[PDB]
Ligand binder design. Structure first.
Ligand code: HEM
Lengths: 255, 255
């Protein structure tokens, strides 16, 4: 409660957005915001957590996702009498995000800040839905991610990417669960009108995307409807969710 | 006792294999080996150094790559009287690795250990080149990687992967410098006998690779000549190079 280690990028952002950023002594590899966290010790990926990395920081509590691991590590943290708080991550919905914000605010003893955060976020998102309902034509999109050292995969149902694409007003053409690698034919069958990828993938040259199977045969490619977004903003549901949704919405229906 | 902070996984490994590990009080996020570094605080990246994070560890010296940055962070450290030591990470040759080992060993006052490490690695690699020389033709190969959220890219000349394929006795079919994304057409046309990828990217299911443009139509994929290597051993030239080289040499010429 006094010294906190957070494993989960968007969780770290929520904690700082609620005014408890003071108690954070360690964060995970997926944490890259806000700026103040850059000087803090980072432990492994929330799925490849290091008990030693964490324990060396003498934390009072650890806050992370329920799908975070390895499991034995969490057992090791509890064994050292460390309070381990875990929150449901998927499937990603606004309802679950609001419940998580409130649970966190409860754990951090800052209930009023949690409620204000939920209110501010919902106001912004509803305004996007209003504007969305004012669009004359629907948009079939797809999100492709190359997170870490994996092959390119398409975001499906239950993913944060999918939740965000939907909030933005687009229809996700992918119907499978979570993330999966698509052969060129599958991507061509999906037939997305617009394709979203991370800025890290493009890194100044859309031609780098040519190694993604089937992408150049897509209508999105031919019609040059490829959008880029910072990966940290599309893989977690944090206090910057409205900003990303508004940005994406803008690129889906420009000018 | 001297307090050292190392930025660059490869350098960290060299320093520990050199017997100067006890003096390290902090490392960066690219550092994941050896196991005893887990208790050390991992702050920043060598491409994105944290002035505040590093100074909070009260280091006497900081060791990193000549191109680590931002440059102004290095200036800050020196201004705070921290001895900053930098080594060239380019080119990825044995001659430069050995020179770096000796520069390190000198700076750390462990010249004998430095020379022993070079000798150990070299003899190991020479044995392999002896076996390779035996055959009359090197196996045509290619290495495909996905790092930092990039699309799949083929390793070209100058890359560490290229240096390791060569030492193992393979002929890198790629002729471009460093990494580039290949279209299905370019990948199929390169027509290598074998294709090396990381274990991280396969993660238990070869079908995950289906999203790499053209790999499914290569001779290597059909002949089932797809080898796996741990990504953590092909992005830097460290103490374990002989290990991955020998490991790979075995797969290029099974039995
Ligand atoms: C090959 C290894 C990796 C795999 C397989 C992987 C996979 C994923 C997946 C599927 C998600 C879920 C996003 C969604 O629901 O749409 C995720 C979240 C995340 N990943 Fe990775 N990832 C890997 C490496 C990394 C690395 C190297 C970073 C870089 C820092 C990174 C940063 C993120 C971030 C920022 C999140 C958000 C977590 C949160 O907000 O709580 N990932 N990753």
């Amino acid at each position: 409660a006094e010294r906190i280690v957070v494993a989960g990028g968007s969780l770290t952002e929520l904690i700082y957005a609620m005014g408890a950023g003071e108690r954070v002594v360690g964060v995970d590899e997926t944490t890259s915001y806000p700026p103040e966290t850059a000087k803090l010790p980072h432990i492994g990926y929330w799925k490849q957590l290091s008990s030693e990395g964490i324990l060396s920081l003498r934390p009072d509590s650890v806050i992370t996702w329920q799908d975070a691991g390895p499991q034995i590590v969490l057992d090791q943290l509890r064994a050292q009498k460390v309070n381990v708080v875990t929150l449901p991550r998927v499937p990603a919905t606004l309802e679950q995000m609001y419940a998580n914000i409130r649970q966190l605010a409860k754990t951090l003893q800052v209930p009023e800040q949690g409620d204000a955060l939920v209110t501010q976020i919902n106001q912004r998102l509803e305004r996007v839905q209003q504007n969305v309902a004012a669009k004359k034509a629907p948009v079939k999109a797809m999100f492709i991610l190359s997170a870490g050292g994996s092959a390119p995969q398409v975001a499906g149902k239950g993913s944060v990417a999918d939740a965000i694409l939907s909030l933005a007003g687009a229809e996700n053409v992918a119907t499978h669960q979570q993330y999966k690698s698509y052969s060129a034919e599958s991507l061509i069958a999906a037939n997305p009108e617009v394709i979203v990828v991370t800025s890290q993938m493009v890194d100044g040259d859309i031609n780098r995307l040519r190694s993604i199977a089937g992408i150049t045969h897509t209508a999105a490619w031919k019609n040059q409807r490829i959008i880029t977004v910072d990966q940290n903003l599309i893989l977690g549901m944090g206090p910057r969710i409205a900003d990303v949704v508004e940005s994406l919405h803008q690129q889906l229906w420009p000018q």
